[PDB]
Symmetry: C2
Subunit: 51 residues, 2 copies
Amino acid sequence: RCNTQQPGCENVCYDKSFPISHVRFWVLQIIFVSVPTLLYLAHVFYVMRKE
Amino acid sequence: RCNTQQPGCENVCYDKSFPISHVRFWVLQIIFVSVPTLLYLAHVFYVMRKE
């Protein structure tokens, strides 16, 4: 909520206040820190096949 | 009219702009201008009545 009457000021002021929400930032953080471990599986299913 | 939602903002922002209006200013001017002429006029009548 903003304290004005000019149409559209709420949209641009909310856009400036929040360039990205915290929850989607945390979702991207959860995604980006899990995929380093998957290559470990790419070792295991490799070497067992060689075994 | 003013570009805000705060109640009472119009009442003070109008009052700062116009501490007096022009049409009430010119009446106060034109009375003070013509006070001495009617003073002289009513004085001369009494002096003529005395003589």
